[PDB]
């Protein structure tokens, strides 16, 4: 609110039509922070057009990488938030931070699993078990990487075998399906298959289809 007797403030601060961002303890912030126009890049001294330390800079249509965080900047030099389309792919950036999404995420009551802003396709572990995040158009015109209805059915993907119960979640552990015993690994829900596996200090032989030989 107030200023200082070098200048200090709190929050987003305009000085001679340059943008700066202060933390509530009056210290200047370097990074991507939210202002009234969106998230901006408050850059270290001398990153573009001889910008002063902590000044928001021109930075257009390109990614930005700070620490282990990824951002995407549009034409107006603000970081995309939410769903954005970069070279034909849909990425997602957290609205609160502008940082790329990672892990399990619900968005408009739809479930996705993100790596570096990108929805991954495959079988991953959400809070309610392993779901099938599927290619686009697999079931009920779903979007790329969206968890889909998948009931009482096997799935082959990336040379692995999964079985999905009535709740569209992948089963884990010892299972009996149509008279056959499988063991789906708790870590990945992948069937043990095509040879010999140690399960709980015991070797078993599993066929290529993942069915345990008695």
């Amino acid at each position: 609110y107030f200023n200082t007797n070098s200048i200090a403030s709190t929050g987003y601060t305009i000085i001679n039509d340059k943008h700066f961002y202060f933390n509530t303890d009056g210290i200047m912030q370097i990074g991507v922070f939210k202002g009234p126009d969106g998230f901006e890049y408050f850059a270290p001294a001398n990153t573009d057009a001889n910008n002063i330390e902590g000044q928001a800079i021109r930075y257009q249509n390109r990614f930005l990488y700070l620490h282990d965080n990824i951002y995407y900047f549009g034409n107006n030099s603000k970081a995309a938030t939410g769903w954005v389309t970069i070279d034909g792919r849909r990425y997602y950036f957290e609205p609160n931070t502008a940082i790329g999404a990672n892990g399990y995420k619900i968005i408009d009551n739809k479930n996705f699993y993100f790596r570096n802003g990108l929805p991954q396709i495959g079988v991953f572990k959400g809070p309610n078990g392993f779901e099938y995040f599927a290619p686009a158009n697999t079931d009920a015109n779903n979007i790329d990487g969206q968890a889909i209805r998948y009931q009482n059915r096997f799935l082959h993907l990336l040379g692995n075998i999964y079985y999905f119960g009535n709740n569209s979640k992948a089963v884990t552990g010892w299972q009996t399906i149509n008279g056959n015993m499988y063991y789906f690994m708790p870590d990945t829900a992948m069937a043990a298959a095509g040879g010999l596996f140690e399960i709980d200090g015991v070797i078993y032989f599993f066929g290529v289809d993942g069915v345990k030989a008695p």
């Epitope: 990614f63 620490h67 282990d68």
Partner: nanobody, 123 residues
Framework: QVQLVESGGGLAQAGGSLRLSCAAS????????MAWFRQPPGKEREFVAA????????YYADSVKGRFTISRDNAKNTVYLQMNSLKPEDTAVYYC????????????????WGQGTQVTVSS
């Protein structure tokens, strides 16, 4: 005003091991990923290694895994490439880059580049 200056090059021999340095000046890179590329002679510039400022994220070209190691000291604003188990193919000019802005770190889209320094491996 901003420069990335490579050093530590020169001649080595098979199985041996060099250590390259890239000192950066004109701005702080303490937040930026840094990377090493190389250009064999006749062949065109190619990716070697890249890392985040924290060290937590690093990527390596297939032909280099286990043998080369990227690291840095943000206090000294410098990135390092530690090249062990050297081979004839490793002979190239090595450039450091900083501040990638492409869709991934393998792409030669980086805001700053060093002039590069020669590395030569014998027999």
């Amino acid at each position: 005003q901003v420069q990335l200056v490579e050093s530590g090059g020169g001649l080595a021999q098979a199985g041996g091991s060099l250590r390259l340095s890239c000192a950066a000046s004109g701005r702080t890179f303490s937040m930026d990923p840094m990377a090493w590329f190389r250009q064999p002679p006749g062949k065109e510039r190619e990716f070697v290694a890249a890392g985040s400022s924290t060290g937590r994220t690093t990527y390596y070209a297939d032909s280099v895994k286990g043998r080369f190691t990227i690291s840095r000291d943000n206090a000294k604003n410098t990135v390092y490439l530690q090249m062990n188990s050297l081979k004839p193919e490793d002979t190239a000019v090595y450039y450091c880059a900083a501040a990638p802005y492409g869709a991934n770190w393998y792409r030669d889209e980086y805001a700053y580049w060093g002039q590069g320094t020669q590395v030569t491996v014998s027999s």
